[PDB]
Enzyme design. Structure first.
Site, short mmCIF file in Angstrom:
data_model
loop_
_atom_site.label_atom_id
_atom_site.label_comp_id
_atom_site.label_asym_id
_atom_site.label_seq_id
_atom_site.Cartn_x
_atom_site.Cartn_y
_atom_site.Cartn_z
N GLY A 45 0.77 -1.19 0.04
CA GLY A 45 0.37 0.30 -0.21
C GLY A 45 0.72 1.52 -0.14
N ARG A 46 0.12 2.70 -1.28
CA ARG A 46 0.51 3.56 -0.16
C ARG A 46 -0.43 4.39 0.69
N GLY A 47 0.61 6.11 1.79
CA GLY A 47 -0.02 6.30 2.54
C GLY A 47 0.72 8.01 2.52
N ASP A 193 -7.62 10.08 12.33
CA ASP A 193 -8.28 9.23 11.46
C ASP A 193 -9.19 8.06 11.25
OD1 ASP A 193 -7.82 9.78 9.08
OD2 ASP A 193 -5.75 9.22 8.50
#
Length: 369
Positions: A45-47, A193
């Site tokens: 994944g990417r953040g 978040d």
């Protein structure tokens, strides 16, 4: 802020605890160079400030993930680390101890004691086990790029998993997420978040982990926080109207929006086209009357970007029920739980323990002991 506000519960954690616990500015991060400790495998994944990879801890062969941090935000990296290590290193998590009501409802304003609900989950629990564990803090031996090493969770993206889940499984998982929130709030931390993308679930193991601690902050009484936090669709009213003196209850609004999405099969639930329109979308459901009552309680003046607000009659929750979601939405309990989470006034919202005592969770509670 004209009118000041304090958290309803867990108000003084960071008076009880000292700078060693919450002062992340005055830490020095011991980055270990990864010359032989972890093998990086494929991307998972990417953040917003990172690229995340699955890998292996070479000495034990344990599968882990490596969050490789894109260059900057040094003070906020230190905050993410302090929070993660605070949460994992607590020897005796507060939420494992017997409940003490007078140490829980710590805001003793008369106006706020009215929000104490007649039900509450007052038992010890293991919500600490539901916070993702940080295992190490490293730098690439060539690039010198810093990274965080975490526990690996075998996750299914929510857009794929959630439509599979039964009423009971949704109840189960949301209770697990509440346990995690109760714990982090007991440790004086707001996540800020909470959303499906930040909740890892390995369904075959009934395992849930709350991840992405990059926006989390320590709760300090009467501190004015930045409102550019969370993600649009999950931002509470306090964020959108720039009420900076907010608290753990922000997370309960986000949890409520997540819940509402799951139950009504409408994702996201509040779909604003812009920051400004996100508020309009909320008001078009909760109604203008209660919105105006909220502004007045706190003597809030709306940011520069806003105009009206126009007059909208509250849309009752029942209006969102349709044939596709009635198997999740067609009971009075879930309606009441949602209504008690999605309130303009943050003081009005259920706390995590309150929500856990709610009737909608009775089938999960009956299975514990």
């Amino acid at each position: 802020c004209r009118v000041w506000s304090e958290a309803r519960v867990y108000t003084n954690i960071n008076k009880q605890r000292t700078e060693e616990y919450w002062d992340y500015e005055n830490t020095v991060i011991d980055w270990s160079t990864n010359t032989k400790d972890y093998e990086i495998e494929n991307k998972v994944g990417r953040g917003k400030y990172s690229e995340v990879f699955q890998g292996v801890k070479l000495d034990s062969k344990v599968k882990i993930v490596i969050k490789m941090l894109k260059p900057v935000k040094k003070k906020k990296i230190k905050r993410e680390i302090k929070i993660l290590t605070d949460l994992s290193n607590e020897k005796v998590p507060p939420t494992t101890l017997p409940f003490q009501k007078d140490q829980y409802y710590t805001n003793q304003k008369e106006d706020v004691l009215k929000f104490i609900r007649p039900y509450i989950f007052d038992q010890p629990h293991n919500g600490h086990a539901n916070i993702i564990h940080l295992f190490d803090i490293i730098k690439d031996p060539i690039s010198k790029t810093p990274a965080l090493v975490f526990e690996y969770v075998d996750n299914v993206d929510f857009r794929i998993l959630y439509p599979k889940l039964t009423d009971l499984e949704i109840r189960f998982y949301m209770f697990e997420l509440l346990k995690a929130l109760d714990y982090c709030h007991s440790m004086g931390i707001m996540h800020r978040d909470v959303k499906p993308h930040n909740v890892m679930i390995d369904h075959k193991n009934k395992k849930l982990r709350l991840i992405d601690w990059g926006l989390a902050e320590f709760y300090h009484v009467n501190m004015e926080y930045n409102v550019r936090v969370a993600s649009r669709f999950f931002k509470g009213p306090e964020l959108l109207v720039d009420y900076r003196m907010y608290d753990y209850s922000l997370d309960l609004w986000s949890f409520g929006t997540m819940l509402a999405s799951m139950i009504f099969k409408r994702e996201p639930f509040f779909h604003g086209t812009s920051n400004t329109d996100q508020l309009v979308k909320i008001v078009k459901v909760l109604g203008t009357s209660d919105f105006e009552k909220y502004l007045l309680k706190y003597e809030i003046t709306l940011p520069r970007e806003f105009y009206d607000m126009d007059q909208y009659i509250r849309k009752p929750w029942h209006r969102f029920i349709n044939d596709g979601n009635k198997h999740l939405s067609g009971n009075d309990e879930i309606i009441d739980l949602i209504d008690n989470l999605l309130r303009y006034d943050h003081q009005e919202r259920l706390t995590a323990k309150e929500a856990m005592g709610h009737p909608w969770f009775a089938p999960i509670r009956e299975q514990i002991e």
